[PDB]
Amino acid sequence: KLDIKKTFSNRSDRVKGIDFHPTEPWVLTTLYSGRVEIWNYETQVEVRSIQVTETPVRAGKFIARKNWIIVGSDDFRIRVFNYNTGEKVVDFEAHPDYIRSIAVHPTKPYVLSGSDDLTVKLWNWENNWALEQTFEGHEHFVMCVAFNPKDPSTFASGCLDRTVKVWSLGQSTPNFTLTTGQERGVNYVDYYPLPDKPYMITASDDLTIKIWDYQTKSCVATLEGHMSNVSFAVFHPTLPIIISGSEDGTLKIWNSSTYKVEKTLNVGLERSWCIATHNYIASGFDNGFTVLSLG
């Protein structure tokens, strides 16, 4: 029932991270300028705005059950803010290099950060934000981390070393390493959220999106059409579609059964960097963000 309606678009400095609040009509953007913005996209008024640092903030997530946002920046630091009171509840150096990605466990007090220091780190906010584990094995920047929603005792890391690695919490080596054949690296990895397919999806600078059966490790499909680096590709949680975005300036919506492109959108904000799904979706670009309703 595709009726792509424009909910709220605003101009800003380059949006590197983006996330939806699960119960309030809010979107968080994290900017290359070091600023982060929480917008109510129904009233189109900012609920909170922070100049966090002067370095890019590439990663940001709500932690709704604690009334927090958590962000990571190129100054090597993870910071957490209560979005109700605005005050900074934690501020620590997480890696000795850029932070690319942050994932929040859906029930347990765990945060994963992936970094240019070649590692993923696990932080426990009920143990004083202690470093509980470092996952070592990747050979280049870890660009993306994501829990398996159907078994969040495992998670995947996407890396510029051209691999995805799937790990078990508390275990020192990958359960398996996925050789993608995406020779310019993996920028993003996402899980299909429903129980009927054991699918992961990867995006690459080599212009491809690939679908993976994580039980057999086989490539199910390869999605081609983007004309520059693919920043992300995700399964929509409720619609039978895949959504991707690229430095060619476009969003693409693909059929998740046939793997053929259904729609290409140039929202006029130059290169696309990040994605969030709530049929709301939101993407951050060089020149701002857009919140879209698909139906």
Binding site: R14, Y32, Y98, R100, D116, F141, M143, L160, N187, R271
Partner: peptide
């Protein structure tokens, strides 16, 4: 040199 600097 830092890849993916942008």
């Amino acid at each position: 040199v830092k890849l993916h600097y942008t």
